[PDB]
Design a protein around this ligand. Structure first.
Ligand SMILES: O=c1ccn([C@H]2C[C@H](O)[C@@H](COP(=O)(O)OP(=O)(O)OP(=O)(O)O)O2)c(=O)[nH]1
Ligand SMILES: O=c1ccn([C@H]2C[C@H](O)[C@@H](COP(=O)(O)OP(=O)(O)OP(=O)(O)O)O2)c(=O)[nH]1
Ligand SMILES: O=c1ccn([C@H]2C[C@H](O)[C@@H](COP(=O)(O)OP(=O)(O)OP(=O)(O)O)O2)c(=O)[nH]1
Ligand SMILES: O=c1ccn([C@H]2C[C@H](O)[C@@H](COP(=O)(O)OP(=O)(O)OP(=O)(O)O)O2)c(=O)[nH]1
Ligand SMILES: [Mg+2]
Ligand SMILES: [Mg+2]
Ligand SMILES: [Mg+2]
Ligand SMILES: [Mg+2]
Ligand SMILES: [Mg+2]
Ligand SMILES: [Mg+2]
Ligand SMILES: [Mg+2]
Lengths: 481, 481, 481, 480
């Protein structure tokens, strides 16, 4: 059993250690071939056909590169081949828990189908990894390559989902803390997962990013902070780190939160909810599950992928008619109509409990205009998107350590006004999109009136095309000229 | 309504006339989102997740570009917007007939399952297009934008499949003959389908494209040739044209005919053959069809995509067990073993009717090696591959017309001797790959002995690793020494 | 005289009209092959070997593309072939006036060698262009192609530098106002010049470009604004527009204002100063000129290129001993040492009239630490960089007109709060870099103490490595630590 | 300390301080002023890259290959000293290039110094010696664990071959594979090629189809004929053929572009007419000509593309002629391409026949009525040898391969074992004819002369033959 080489368009020829090969050649890993990275985004960007599989290969590769580079530059860290392999496996397996259409499933479907439970794709990754190991005889292969199953499996899980419950990690001591910053960085969000999806998503979407992860790896060091060994960036790179997050935000603005892509994720979520009772997925022993309950049994979850979209589309049963028809609306491109975008003002934000009261509000506005129809709450969709730098209101660069050329072992901090005045003032904000399920001319005119009026009543930002879609409405708001 | 813009990672922003949008937004066309361009190639090249949908868009785009450029450079040709639109539609629609995993379906599955039928994906494209037209109310929409459905539908079909039966075409007169050279070039095979797949497949496989189609388009012109108007190329580009085909060959050698990709297509085909008596696909009138019979009913064929792979894989029915098992062999990477490659020598050419008897020849070989395993004919797979420049044994550049700078309307011919002595001396050859369905070490050893002996017996070429995998066989053959 | 095609790595195959061909093949234009786009940047980024020549080709090409797109989308604008050609000529010729090492010349050398005159590369471009036209008999070729030299030459120069002085233009009337927005946009800075250098500089530097100019071109219209027919962008694009400026900023930060690249431009500049009495360039009639004076005779300026750097370098004349030695220090990489970067705080704005006072202040600072060596004013360099969005303190997007899909001919305005709260609050800032000419250790320590103390006294931002380069000085400033 | 350089081709490359010290010398920095493709820049405007960045690239790739070999196979005993020597060799193998690169050693020198045997290789060795001596590199080398006597010899041998049975001195036979990296005299597969494939493609606007990273990943060292040599994996053989095919393509499209070559020729002519009058100052203040600068490394250090601009800008009337040719380049008044043909049969044209060629063309007697009579000073005949790097031989016959099943056993693979669609021949010649007189009538004449000549010598029919000379072509029965 030898290394295999895989050719990836992003990273080139990637070498895979035989243990990694063993992990990859399982139903649990191969499942990721049938889950689109960007979910419904493929229906807007036809280049975005990539799946979580190739992305995961990429993450394992980059984890390997960063750990090896650190060990190579700093022998005093005593990074072992075992550490390298463990970081590699963590990188390969942190996407194991994604469901159909990726972030649609944990972001939209699950919270609606099962409001009581709090599921994340990370927990799904830990559970799925445990099921892969246990179902495929991986433990003895691990020990066969000088890994210690007990400690190392724990380590892998921890890298993926953080502490399983003062130094909180049991997989590795403080003197190897930096290993936990590579795959999924809880501290500042700077990790190789972001790097792979930046490059890969850009390559498939046909839009480009200027973040250079290779450069970052070149200047990465391990230095001591707060009695921990942590990864530090070279000082002169601070400007680039800021740009990194800018790139993230840009990618969210252009692709990941494209209004139509989001409405397609919403319509698919909708079809999944109408189908949940009727689609049977066989789990362990023979117990049958639903889409919403498959997350309870990894055997059933292994068979839960993008495929059910087509399963719903191709079905003939009356019980699935309503599900089916929605999907067909997607095929005919009869999508819900986008009405518009606005934002709250001040330090006023919309929290999660108010999300379902919003269609009603939009429907409750009184545009002093004569309409041919009346719309009700059920006719509107209100989608609230949080855009941030990955730590709510915080600046993540406040949580990065730097080192300078004159004392490369000394960690320091760099504040925002040590860098530039042209940087953002805040680091979190909310976008509000409104869509109408009635797609005829009249109803959409009406919808625009209700919408702009609702914006005026709540002192939100003036829609960019406000003066065009509601000329009778905008003048009442003097703050809009 | 109005035109749309699509961002494609290969061509950038592609503009779509609303009629094209109407054609694309149908089940018949959207179907192509669920058919991988390279079929089983994705299982070897993880970047190759692209489907026939995006490829089809790219082809329609390029057909548009070429006809437009011709029109702009030579107004005397009288190309109308109607012509442009019909060529764009043909470009968009020549891929409509592809089945699950593309060339696996018409190259491997149909020939085995329905050997009495002479099916091609092109015919499939014509029937599927007829069904899209009729099921989606397209004719009046065509009339609305200035097209004449009778004639123009004829024209499109002819561009896809050739004459539906001296001028054999009824969709356009001889003075527009060059328009038939764009989408699917029956004369020499230089068309825009190739250009799109060169660039897109290369972009996704992580292999770099050598061919510059924009350059070609800039130096394309129409000239009179044998009382016919044809697309001719600038003389200086003749080398480039040769390189084009070289590229095609290279792509076939590295990717499209990859030994493992091919064995994967073969295993999927085997599974389909074993699932064929059980999978039912509802056609028109609620009539039932099989995977093998879907091609007789466009309503059923519409529902026949890559999804069946998963339908088979997730099935619980005992009667599907076998098929299911084969697919599971794929997930665990327990694939049929590659034994070797050889070629015929002299002027021996393997006939299509001789294919079936080949594993029997191999099993009946008598290698002088001691073996603890005897293999039967049914243990061997023999895959015969015809590699050519697209016109069997002919040089396609002998079917290209050129023009000179000084006389831009005088068509000429250029022979291979006028170009280089470093070019191929033949334009077709056969590659014979042998595989073994028994994957154990002993079986693979024995299979290697049989294979090399069979090569010796038939005076085929010495396998590249012959001296290594069969050191006791290769000495007997003096022509190899 | 027919069309030529040029292959360019950025744009691919550029078609050049015979008139542009005749303009390009002159000494005046070919001169640009010998002037590096990024001056001293090549000494830091080895891929940046590109010259002003190819950039000029790119700019001309894109100007052509934009005017052409505008014309095909809106025939009512009556754009003529004349217009296309003049916009192309302006695009081709707007870089004609650059001098040795590009921005080094008009940005450092001329302002120091000739404080009394106000000169810029744009004026250089108009003068050079006039010279080209008259020395090469271009007017009759222009007339041969249907141009009208009187108004068209004016139109071209106007596009390059603006009004030569109510509507202030002679070349074209108000209903063609948008044509003045293409090559050099004096209203908001969005023009094709920027687009070409984004793409080209990124290609050569090894940094990736994230601005998509083809998308912009595709979404651009012409609308009525304040009695003028201006170019408007789709509302949707607003985010991207902001990103466009961000990119510009990033490119300045990473490459164009690189500390070492700037110090190299400085050393080259003062070498030119040392050589300014002693080098002779033969001008019109046979007169002699200096490097600082070739600016006054176009025939002399034609021979002023990067070549001069080598003249000095290769010289043996004792009169040039000083200059020469400096260039040699660049060859051995014995450069002035960088000691730090800081910014002003509050409302403080370092004026040009004060630059000269800066090295004296640093030498005047009294650090309060043990120094082995004293440094004087001559030992310091202070470089002041003005970073902005190209309109000083103003937001350029406030000066951009938009349109919505609902009523495409209806120009509108978009404000910053209508886009994002994560945007810059300020659109201009200043960076202050300090270097020391004395390069030994002790000198460097000294320079660091002086510098940090100076930042402390001037109430400037605390240097990033401040606690490391001068620990004994930093705790005296309460706002800092 | 170490330095990081951002290259558009390879990304962020790390240079050891020793390499930095070698690089920060006038002898090395000189390469910033010499264009990789010379006159090619006047046809492909993206092709502005110089030898400096290419040299960095070659150094980097040499380091990559030797390091990969070392990591996969510890038993080879590759030391950091070996690594450094191979890097230095890659970094320095382009040091001997003159103005406009291959124009200088390919066109100028053979016409100006026909008695000398000169290669950019020899110049690289001499320039390396001079660089080492003029900058005190030896003690820096010793400082980083190098042994100057052995190692300098090793580097020179890597660049130019043996200096004159194991013919090498810098390293023994068990390190033979080290000699296959920077300049492979055995089959021509080396990192120099790989770098220029990628860089030239990047700047030309043509896409490279050879994947050298894949090659590096698959390369191993195996024992072959009592040497340890680099071996490629068997199944890569196709790709190897493609590599040479790629080389040929690049020559067809760019390096041997008709107009690119005529521009190189015009520049050469200008240098020839300038050579008696340009003065370069070398050691001891002594003076040298362009054609003699190669005899003194101090003066060669100052010999770059700048010469072009020194000639164009000159005011000295002695340099008038020279200056006027370059000016015609600026006005795009170039010698006119009349056509391309090829020898048939076993006929092969040798260098010593070259100068006789314009004479034969002017002596041909086209049976058409003309207006001007052309002479043998109005014609230019350029002869191009296109091959796979080893004249008539197949370089793949000089590659060692290994198989997955026995990775330490080297094997050979023949052409017939790979494909019948491969070339039957591995070398050929292209004959281009240009005319120095650019009027329509002289051009028509030149065409008639050219085709008549092609017929007389039984050469191949020019591609535009029927068009540029409809009265000449139907005579030659073999073209019909
Ligand atoms: O010319 C090629 C051939 C293959 N690949 C890719 C496909 C795959 O992702 C990786 C490895 O395939 P390869 O053919 O090298 O390995 P293999 O099929 O498993 O052969 P073997 O087991 O004999 O090493 O390289 C390329 O990029 N270029
Ligand atoms: O910043 C962006 C936004 C979108 N796209 C792509 C996505 C899509 O393939 C195409 C068009 O999307 P767009 O957002 O422009 O169209 P739309 O969503 O239909 O908006 P509208 O109907 O209002 O024009 O361009 C980009 O490349 N970059
Ligand atoms: O295979 C090629 C050949 C040329 N070029 C470039 C070189 C140049 O930048 C442009 C045009 O050169 P071309 O050879 O096509 O024109 P020409 O030399 O002037 O020949 P002719 O006058 O017969 O058209 O195309 C390529 O990119 N690829
Ligand atoms: O954001 C950047 C900055 C620089 N470079 C390039 C330029 C150069 O080729 C190489 C190294 O430059 P750098 O600025 O990192 O090194 P330096 O100027 O020598 O700084 P220092 O000596 O303090 O490490 O990286 C980039 O690619 N991106
Ligand atoms: Mg394998
Ligand atoms: Mg994350
Ligand atoms: Mg839309
Ligand atoms: Mg075809
Ligand atoms: Mg030409
Ligand atoms: Mg430095
Ligand atoms: Mg060589």
């Amino acid at each position: 059993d030898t290394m295999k080489v895989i050719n990836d368009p992003i990273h080139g020829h990637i070498e895979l250690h035989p243990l990694l090969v063993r992990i990859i050649d399982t139903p649990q890993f191969q499942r990721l071939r049938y889950i689109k990275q960007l979910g419904g985004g493929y229906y807007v960007f036809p280049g975005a056909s990539h799946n979580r599989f190739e992305h995961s290969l990429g993450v394992g590769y980059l984890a390997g590169c960063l750990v090896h580079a650190l060990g190579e530059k700093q022998p005093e860290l005593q990074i072992s081949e075992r550490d390298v392999l463990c970081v590699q496996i963590a990188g390969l397996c942190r996407n194991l828990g994604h469901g159909p259409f990726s972030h649609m499933f944990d972001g939209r479907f699950i919270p609606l189908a099962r409001p009581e439970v709090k599921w994340t794709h990370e927990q799904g990754s830990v559970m799925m990894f445990e099921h892969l190991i246990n179902s495929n005889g991986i433990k003895p292969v691990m020990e066969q390559y000088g890994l210690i199953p007990e400690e190392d499996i724990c380590f892998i899980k921890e890298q993926i989902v953080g502490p399983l419950e003062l130094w909180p990690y049991k997989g590795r001591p403080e003197n190897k803390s930096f290993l936990y910053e590579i795959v999924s960085n809880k501290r500042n969000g700077i990790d190789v997962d972001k790097w792979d999806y930046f490059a890969r998503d850009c390559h498939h979407l046909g839009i480009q990013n200027n973040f250079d992860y290779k450069r970052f790896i070149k200047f990465a060091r391990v230095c001591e902070v707060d009695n921990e060994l942590r990864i530090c960036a070279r000082d002169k790179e601070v400007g680039n780190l800021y740009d990194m997050f800018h790139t993230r935000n840009s990618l969210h603005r252009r692709a990941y939160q494209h209004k139509v892509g989001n409405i397609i994720d919403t319509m698919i979520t909708d079809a999944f909810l109408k189908a949940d009772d009727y689609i049977e997925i066989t789990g362990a022993g023979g117990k049958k599950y639903r889409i919403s309950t498959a997350i309870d049994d990894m055997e059933a979850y292994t068979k839960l992928t993008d495929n059910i979209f087509l399963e719903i589309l191709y079905s003939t049963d009356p019980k699935l008619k309503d599900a089916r028809e929605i999907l067909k609306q997607i095929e005919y491109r009869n999508l819900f109509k986008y009405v518009g975008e606005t934002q709250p003002t001040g330090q006023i934000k919309i929290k999660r409990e108010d999300y379902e009261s919003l269609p009603k509000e939009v429907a409750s506005a009184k545009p002093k205009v004569l309409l041919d129809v009346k719309l009700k709450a059920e006719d509107f969709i209100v989608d609230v998107i949080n855009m941030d730098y990955g730590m709510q209101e915080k600046n993540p660069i406040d949580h990065v350590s730097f080192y300078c050329k004159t004392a490369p072992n000394r960690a320091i901090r760099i504040t925002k006004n040590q860098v530039s005045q042209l940087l953002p003032e805040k680091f979190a904000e909310q976008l509000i999109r409104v869509y109408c399920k009635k797609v005829d001319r009249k109803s959409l005119y009406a919808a625009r009136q209700y919408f702009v009026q609702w914006c005026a009543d709540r002192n939100f930002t003036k829609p960019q095309d406000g003066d065009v879609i509601a000329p009778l409405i905008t003048p009442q708001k003097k703050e809009w000229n």
